[PDB]
Symmetry: C4
Subunit: 359 residues, 4 copies
């Protein structure tokens, strides 16, 4: 019996091959930020109000004007079919059951179209990478619009891939039967048919395909390109958050890319308040990185995030029992968040306030 999210990782290591487990598990380099994403949540202490009447705790909220069952949503984990045969399609179906949203990776092992077909009524957004080939980028955006995706989350922190040490020791790359389904060429589909040498296959993929020259000029282009809400994912500084708002973007996702890019950046829960402050109420702010418990969700919302995204636990759900496993992980987090809300005097998400936390 798996009763908490920690239980799931424990189990996922027992079933996945090392290369696939290490890929999902890893942080960059010495993994300092990886540990900190978790340890940081513990440092923020909770100050619950008593006797507030919490009989019918309502977890419902909205992300970018769309209703969700809870401020807990699925983040864009790449290449989910390595964890479960059903991959991204199991994930979207779980999201459809939960009433929450799924961010789909540009590097998904299932296509934008496939995912919409498996979860037609699920809230779905696209995580976008900016490709050297702008026609490829445009195509992803257009396909997301066509298929009823409700926003673009542009990743802005990966001009190159971080150095995850296990992926290089393991010579990481997709199993022979799998591809990045959003692309048609061998190169852009991350075909395991290539010999990538003595390094991570993903680091090479990105170096070849993804544009390190990415700048605010590209943000201007993207903003003119789509009328969809656009969220900047990977922002860690207040002055960059200000710049995003100025470029007409509609949200910031505070993220250190699951501790997999630049190591030694702060925990997301630690930078969240500076971003919420920099944005001056203009745009919704979200958080990912280290969320494992309902109290983590409470802390991020007290500090001003609208919603949080869940990365690794989703993969671990997938690896345990596919769709049901993702559904169960999401239901564990939901009921932990409900209990934490109620114990802190919060009937609904609107009465969550920052007096609930102190560092």
């Amino acid at each position: 019996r798996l009763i908490c999210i920690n239980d799931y990782e424990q189990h996922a290591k027992s079933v996945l091959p090392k290369s696939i487990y290490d890929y999902y598990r890893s942080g960059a380099n010495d993994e300092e930020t990886l540990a900190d994403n978790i340890a940081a949540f513990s440092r923020w202490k909770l100050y619950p109000r008593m006797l507030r009447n919490v009989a019918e705790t309502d977890l419902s909220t909205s992300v970018l004007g769309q209703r969700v069952s809870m401020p807990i949503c699925v983040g864009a984990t790449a290449m989910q079919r390595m964890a479960h045969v059903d991959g991204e399609l199991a994930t979207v179906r779980a999201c459809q059951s939960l009433g929450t949203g799924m961010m789909l990776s540009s590097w998904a092992t299932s296509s934008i179209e496939e995912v919409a077909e498996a979860g037609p009524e699920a809230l779905r957004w696209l995580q976008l990478y900016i490709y050297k080939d702008r026609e490829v980028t445009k195509k992803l955006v257009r396909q997301a619009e066509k298929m009823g995706y409700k926003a673009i989350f542009v990743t802005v922190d990966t001009p190159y891939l971080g150095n995850r040490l296990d992926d290089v020791r393991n010579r990481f790359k997709l199993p022979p039967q799998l591809r990045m389904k959003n692309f048609e060429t061998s190169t852009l589909s991350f075909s395991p048919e290539e010999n990538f040498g003595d390094d991570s296959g993903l680091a090479a993929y990105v170096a070849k395909a993804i544009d390190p020259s990415i700048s605010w000029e590209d943000i201007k282009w993207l903003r003119r390109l789509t009328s969809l809400p656009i969220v900047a994912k990977g922002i860690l500084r207040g002055d960059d958050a200000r710049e995003a708002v100025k470029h007409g973007l509609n949200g910031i996702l505070v993220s250190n890319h699951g501790a997999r890019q630049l190591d030694g950046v702060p925990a997301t829960i630690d930078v969240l308040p500076e971003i919420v402050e920099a944005v001056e109420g203009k745009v919704e702010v979200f958080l990912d990185g280290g969320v494992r418990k309902g109290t983590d969700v409470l802390k991020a919302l007290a500090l001003g995030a609208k919603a949080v995204f869940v990365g690794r636990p989703i993969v671990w759900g997938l690896a345990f029992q596919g769709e049901k496993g993702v559904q169960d992980v999401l239901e564990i987090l939901k009921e932990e968040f409900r209990l934490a809300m109620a114990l802190s005097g919060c009937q609904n998400v609107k009465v969550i306030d920052k007096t609930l936390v102190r560092k």
Copy 2:
């Protein structure tokens, strides 16, 4: 030979069945506050005065106008007959011998009447839960008044039960021969005859019986209902402490419910000063959570608590040697507190002052 309180827990694990040991031992979720309740006491350092004449250290004080032999009293540990056949009755008899007070749990395995009969001359108070059925709540209050109980400690931090992970893995519930003796129905007596499913039997008990809508309106009701002193137990915030005083309550018990409710709240010794300050001398403040040593008692009193309550060590005393074991735990704490008082220059509790501590 058991010579300190730590010795007792060590021993209690060796004799109790796992389910019963885990139930008493547990904190909520990842048990962060559990560890912190203890670690926090160590961070407050002592600044003893020398050459003060401490030849006849007097430990005597008062709780809510009633005299006690020492500012160390027994907190409301539920279902004591799981640790020792004599349960709550061994406890009250030890309290009678010591000259200190016992708070009786609403969820005791011995009745309010039984306990008064076993300790007629012992100082006794009732820890109250607010039940969905107000007639049940009223009955407990009336029975406490009838039986010579001298105050009501209302718990205000349990609209639902915290999630203690071991209790759910163990499917915790009372052994077949035991009940919550204050109640007559199967439901309200926590009859182990029920099949509680794949979770804690206690979490279900509370969800069914205990009113999550509890508010300050219920506090107003309770205050009109009894002329007994009422103490708010579970308060962790200064603004809530202020509210209690305003509702005409007679004390605050600073408690995080032994780290078993909302995890990630501060240690009680850490919030104590903010509560003492919020209350502005109007009402007595007590503390529970993490008290294991005489120096813990000294620290809480220097910071302004009138008295402290002892939870788990009492159960561990019970589990070692019943009445004698509880008596011995209380005598260990008494002599540790006496030694700590004397070494710090304090002849009596009235000259304990806050210059004795700094964080």
Copy 3:
């Protein structure tokens, strides 16, 4: 080959019987201050000056107007003959060889007279306890004066003995052949012929013989009683240090009694600056507790101590090789202190200054 002080303790445990090792090793209760006496020194960082000309580093200084070879002196460890047959006499002879001073315990296993005879030219002071019998106290002071002892260090932090847990488990008491040689009665000589029951023999000794009523009135008495310099040993507070100066005392020894009295007091190196400040240049301040390295000595002197005292390492020297072992421990500390002085730009003790340290 033993080349540092840590090496000596390591070895002492291998040769001493457990009861004797535990007695010397122990702190009070959970031993928090014990660990902190050491860990605290590490937190103070050194800021060495370069290019100062340190060719002939002079370690010489003075304690209470008497010259010493180095600001490193022997503290009053009780009952040294438990570690080595030669006990206190080996110690004084080592001190005589080094040119530094020895503080003799009131609870020495060698008499005030014996020690003066074995080290006639050694600088010697008496550590005094105030006995219930004032004639006994007077006698110790008079014998120290008669025998060429140059100061009285009155201990002010032991109205009762701290609770050292191992001493109670071990039923600590002197081996059959040994006594506290400064006394003639069975009681006052700590005769092991007595059955002390289920506790520390030393805790009983003190409870029976040593006056818990000790106050500033007794300090006034002692000051009128002898024209010897008097130092208050055990002071941890600035307001008490002020009081000592006002009573006409000639020094303060910042001490938490080797972490063996009240546990949870600060490290001595941490309180030292507040005492140096409280004393306003009027009197010399010394430090004991946790000194194991030459850099510890440097730190205490930068913070304003005139000299430091060494407790446990002396016993460990005694236990390794008697007189030679104490001499070697003292020579290790001397050369470590010389090296640390030179590396920090300090030719002599007078140019040691507080810019050398920051916490």
Copy 4:
């Protein structure tokens, strides 16, 4: 496959004899500063800018007016031929391949002339010790000038050698076939033919040969003696840095001598900002001590260092695979630094700024 610098040390211990490994590995005394040199880098957190266009990250910079391929240079590790037969000559050839500079130890197992011959086009500087014999010191300076060395790094923190405990237990000294090649006498060449007794052979070497009277007067002499740039190596205080600038020196190398001199000084990354501030833009500041990763290099440069020096990793490269091993260590650091620069929004070293870091 060795893919990070940590991998190299791990391997070096497996191949080197203990005495040689311990000598290179060691810090002074309890090795507190040793651990801290590393742990300190982790405490400084990175605040990367996004969307800055980092397509052609240029690592090129200059040290003291000479161009280097990257702000990462080789520090003056003594006696390299103990790690590899080719010693300093393998090192200079690797530096020649990399386009970066090598600081040559006064205590090199290869001569100033030998090194220039093996790396004629490599940027080379001399690390100078001030000898009791000033003719010896003058000779080293003159030989460096003659041989195309481009600066003098005078070490100012070794009036005596630190106490490295393993070197004394091991009776450290050069293997029979090796000498300090810059000297002709037995004494000054550190001939292993001598019996050095029961201590470090290097501590004796320094005590006999190196002048503990070193002062600012000697700095004045050295400044008049050569027109080469002079850098003060070993400075840890702002007031000393000020003094260096005043004596007409051309740089400061912030160093605690790899934690091998005075233990308990701060980490170099921690003192760096105070030195950069004390120097008021007048002179370039460098850092050594604890550099193992590209992010360490980024942090030192954000805090105002022009370049950093690498000590132990070079020896570990040497011990793994001689020239190729040193080259590979330097290439690992280069590509880690490039990745870290790019991920933080930095196209070139000139846009590295201090907003990138906070402690």
